[PDB]
């Protein structure tokens, strides 16, 4: 009714398991036809968060018993080195385990045939060198800036309509971004409203809250200040514990100190011109009254993130106590207003004198799916930072993958003994790929592998998987192109990964009803 | 249709579950490192009798519901016109149902797949003749007459301590056998009463009757008369009773006329030198008394098998009415005589004209284990006739499939569409094959398995699995050779049995009469 | 009723089953081809633990009925005076129980045998020297100094791919630390930075702390602060009373008051031209704005075992409060600066003066399985420190193991009576080690035993059992080498383990439910 009970060989299997049930989910989103899920939870989860993206859904939630979760957190390692594009590297560590299979066929030491791992150390440098033609991207960059890469990350996605538009639109951004900076404080939000750009550009910062009912509609001239620690006031850290007095009027004086903390905020609120007030973390009721008449904007629980981004574009401040307004306090003033975008209620924050970091506000169609706006968004900007700093890349759609794995089968049967065994059962791997990408184009897996084989055997490196057109195309007119970096680091990565699978094997649970 | 309802999984595991029952028992069987197995059953049994043949064992029982007693009768039509050596076609046909789960996680068209069994057709062609498959066998052959394929067959088998000499005895039957055509008149009946060598060979046919008590015990110079008909006259085919005659005229007609049947008989044996007397069927007694006077022995109910094979080696005869005599029948005239080989008296023909072919006459120890050389025999007979029919054959000892497979592996690669999938899976199945000589022996498969591809990469396709070396060694200096029949059959027949099963549409009931 | 009862010959068994389930997870743990293995449990776990060391794992938890516990929480007194080594000694004290069996057949009376333990003493001792050690170990040394027993040590770790380079690291450590005071003075720490290395050594200690975002970057010509108080001043915990204030005015003179530790710290600080402050524990707020102008660099929170090895390092400093300056402390001169590590902030202090003590910084890719390298580096120093102070050592691999057993089957014959039967069999079980370590290398171990055999016999110490060779070779050249330490106490530790099973005919528990 419940049983369980795994031993050796059975053991190796619950390493199997996790794979396939992770290749199944993933396998649909690869390419132009991707697929798109919903996952829900409740206990600290609100309701159906969906994920195009791979790596952040695996990353947040550890789901059950099997062992998985160490392989999924080493992807985001690879995301930083890189990551994105399209989501592959986990099913190619999957499918490897598949030949395990064949391992107990085999019948000696499974130990012995890891050096297949070591043997695809090299064979990920075969493919660091003979791949595809395509390489620095100059500077800033005209015509090139995009219309490249940010687009083969979309393909897969189905928003690339509009979308490939919004795409063009983040290497602006990153140009911008573009110095000794890194990469740091640019933040893109969507919005409910319909507009064929779907996109805009703003010269500041974007931020969703307001003070309340009541206040000035709009600031000019602006003073900024930003609270660490919040308005409200009487807990400290030791209490001073709870007490009696004995006085008709002592019970009175502790309110009247209250009045004390409402009238430091407004004389010098005043002096200093304060338009408005961002806070991260809960307001006391009393100040708000006071901010009213003043004709102060207040932003109550702002979003700390939001506020960091904010601080070096404004010229920042020290948020301490009180005393934080005036010098300490840095304010640039140009606009801050809530703007009638089309559809909701947002405030910009303009005119920033830092110049260094900008932010974009996406416009869309609107339910959860407009969230793949943020979904597609946040590969754009990663993506071509590095697109840049490498200075090269290497052809798409899987053109990459046919190619390397022609030259691995001539591998395993030059290796002598027992790694020629280990050595081909990696070569296959890359077979899978091409499969994968197939697969959710809706076309048919098994044709599709025949026909792309024998074009890089040909000899072009162009040439690759076309899932629009059913068949094999060249590439370089799509302009789908994979960063050299995404390649180098995956055959490392999936190799380690994969290897504490077989490491594994054993788990334990005791007895029956 | 009878019942039995099954369609796509559910249906396809039956089949799937019979083929591995099957070859962990046959397994152990192959080569020279084989083993006998015994079974214990009741019924029309009572005891364990051992069989080495995987095919006489399978005959005899059918144990349960899942159907596999079909696949397992056509074994024998294999076994009487080539069949034996070592068991491998049933475990070849059972192999390739394994990668029917590895289908399931292809989960298209299983049909699609099957279109690799016409390719496999072609390419095994392709395959056998792109293998060296051995260069000697010049005819008659002093030395490799044997002491190579036989000599595996006889070693799995148990009686191998002295009965590999036995072996050695078969080729010589063959090679005076080898002429424009057919297989036919090799039989041999085993005898109890123990010798070292454990065999004597008769140079003509070995029969079990005799005429009665009386007739000359030698004859010399002796001429073979065969009849089609019977010598017993009056009944026509209704016996109409002995009965009473009608009247007093009427007993004259039949009985004078018996006589009459008696002198016929007389005048036509005298004039030809008749000394033995062959009929398949019932013998009237009149002719007997005349038999043992004219000097003719007679043989009583003679079975028609040894008859027909017999014919070749007397030159054989039209059998028509008793006007057969003279011309129209051919006898030989050597030697007939019954001889006391020693218990179990028996008659011996000897001294065929023609040559073509000879009984061998078996006789050992005194054991039913002696019994158990009958069934290895069968296995020489029929491996041996092809090599004189083919002119041809093949390397052994896995030398010419480890060729093959690395022929093959490469030939995947040049093809497109249908045939790249189905034929790297073949090329594949074909690695297990040296793991199993290997594994038979003794020896670590892992060690053997490539240290063996490197040999046939080379190009000697003499070097191949030495069991007795427990490494690889030259197959050539062993002398063990396939005929090329024993290759062409098991590989086109593994295909198709595997084929029927999957595509399978009823194969219903058990039933026969 | 039902039950488990045990009595005699009963009890007995189950002891026996305890020690073969135990060798069989542990016997993959040793020599160079080890294998790692992870537990997950539940009811009081967290995580699943990895753990190569067989000690740690075993004393954790007690899993089931059968009793071994015991058995295993005596080898942790053994990991405290030499230890770890590779895990050899409950594979020894299991096999041990195997000869049992015999012993019935022996019939006479099982403490009889106990003899045979105090003859394994004196074989052991005639093994102890016999053969002739390793030769030089002189201290500092050149070649020999690693690429030895740490890589044993690490031989049964799986994270050896990397991993023997950070081993032969380790050495150098040991040769800075070989004088007048065991283990207490080195700190290791690793990182969250990747690279193929893996590992670095600082000439001096190293910490991971920053004052904040200001203050000048290097200091030269250092002086260095360490206090045992914080910088924090108010509550004590004797409030100076329970007092209110008004409104917060009258506060304002305590807050003058705060402005004296202001003041003191400055002007103790400024004479002696303080570099760097360092304090374990809380800071306050006030100081730090002071540090920043003067030029001085202060740590917040440092750990105080690091600050414990910093004090023997820089000639210490007797630590109380705001009195510590001057000459009450003492400060190293060379260098101290914060320099970038991978993707972390760290700080080194170097050119100490003492040299007795430096630090090794650990790399790594940045995963838990990472967190593996601290594991081992614990193992690492003790060993070391051991094997060259004990100045003796024997060849690894099992070349002692096999070398022993030959001299012990010979003693066995030459003497006369009772003693012989007890003394042979200990003779016997030696024979089982080569066989462990060849098993779990993946090759067979029945042939590698008497090839072992052969090279032992001839007189050559330095010969062994070469797992990555699959035969027979020279460990010297490989370098691998065993400390004395384990082989001493394991032939004593191991004999009062087995003296205790045989003897007790009565244990009386129960349990299982």
Same mark, same amino acid.
């Given at each position: 009714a419940g049983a369980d009970e795994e031993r050796a060989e059975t053991a190796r299997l619950s390493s199997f398991i996790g794979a396939i049930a992770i290749g199944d989910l993933v396998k649909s989103t690869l390419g132009p036809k991707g697929m798109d899920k919903i996952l829900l939870s409740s206990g600290r989860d609100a309701s159906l968060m969906v994920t195009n993206d791979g790596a952040t859904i695996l990353k947040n939630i550890g789901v059950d018993n099997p062992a998985a979760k160490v392989l999924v957190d080493m992807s985001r390692v690879?995301?930083?080195?890189?990551?994105?594009?399209?989501?592959? $590297?986990?099913? /190619?560590?999957?499918?490897?385990?598949? @030949? =395990?299979?064949?391992?107990?066929?085999?019948?000696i030491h499974p130990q012995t045939i890891?050096?297949?791992?070591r043997e695809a150390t090299k064979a990920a440098r075969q493919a660091?060198?003979?791949?595809?033609?395509?390489?620095?991207?100059?500077?800033?960059?005209?015509?090139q800036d995009l219309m490249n890469i940010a687009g083969t990350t979309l393909s897969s996605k189905l928003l690339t309509h509009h979308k490939d538009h919004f795409t063009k639109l983040a290497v602006?951004? $990153?140009?911008? /971004?573009?110095?000794?900076?890194?990469? @740091? =404080?640019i933040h893109v939000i969507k919005k409910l409203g319909g507009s064929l750009a779907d996109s805009y550009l703003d010269e500041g910062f974007l931020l969703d809250k307001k003070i309340g009912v009541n206040q000035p509609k709009r600031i000019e001239n602006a003073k900024i200040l930003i609270a660490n620690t919040g308005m409200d006031t009487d807990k400290i850290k030791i209490f001073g514990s709870r007490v009696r007095v004995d006085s008709t009027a002592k019970v009175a004086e502790i309110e009247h100190a209250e009045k004390e903390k409402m009238k430091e905020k407004v004389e010098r609120i005043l002096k200093h011109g304060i338009n408005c007030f961002i806070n991260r973390q809960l307001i006391y009721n009393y100040p708000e009254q006071l901010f009213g008449a003043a004709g102060v904007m207040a932003i109550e629980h702002a979003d700390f993130v939001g506020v960091e981004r904010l601080a070096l574009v404004t010229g920042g401040e020290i948020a301490s106590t009180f005393d934080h307004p005036e010098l300490?306090?840095?304010?640039?003033?140009?606009?801050?207003?809530?703007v009638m975008i089309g559809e909701d209620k947002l405030i910009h924050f303009s005119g920033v004198a830092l110049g260094e970091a900008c932010t974009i506000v996406l416009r869309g169609a609107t339910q959860q799916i407009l969230d793949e706006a943020e979904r597609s968004l946040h590969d754009a900007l990663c993506v071509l930072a590095q697109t840049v700093k490498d200075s090269r890349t290497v052809y798409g759609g899987g053109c990459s993958e046919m190619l390397m794995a022609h030259a691995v089968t001539q591998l395993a049967s030059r290796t002598p003994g027992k790694e020629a065994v280990a050595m081909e059962s990696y070569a296959k791997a890359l077979r899978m790929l091409p499969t994968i990408i197939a697969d959710n184009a809706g076309y048919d897996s098994a044709?599709?592998?025949?026909?792309?084989?024998?074009?890089?055997?040909?000899?072009?490196?162009?040439?690759?998987?076309?899932?629009?057109?059913?068949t094999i195309g060249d590439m370089s007119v799509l302009g789908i192109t994979e960063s050299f970096q995404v390649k180098r680091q995956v055959l490392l990565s999936a190799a380690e990964a994969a290897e504490v699978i077989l490491r594994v094997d054993n788990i334990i649970k005791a007895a029956p009803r």
């Open positions: 690879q995301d930083d080195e890189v990551g994105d594009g399209t989501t592959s $590297v986990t099913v /190619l560590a999957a499918e490897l385990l598949r @030949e =395990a299979e064949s391992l107990i066929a085999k019948k890891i050096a297949g791992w660091l060198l003979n791949s595809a033609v395509d390489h620095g991207s100059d500077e800033v960059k005209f015509r602006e951004a $990153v140009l911008r /971004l573009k110095g000794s900076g890194n990469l @740091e =404080a300490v306090k840095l304010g640039s003033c140009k606009l801050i207003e809530e044709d599709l592998v025949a026909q792309l084989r024998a074009a890089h055997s040909e000899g072009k490196t162009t040439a690759g998987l076309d899932m629009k057109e059913g």
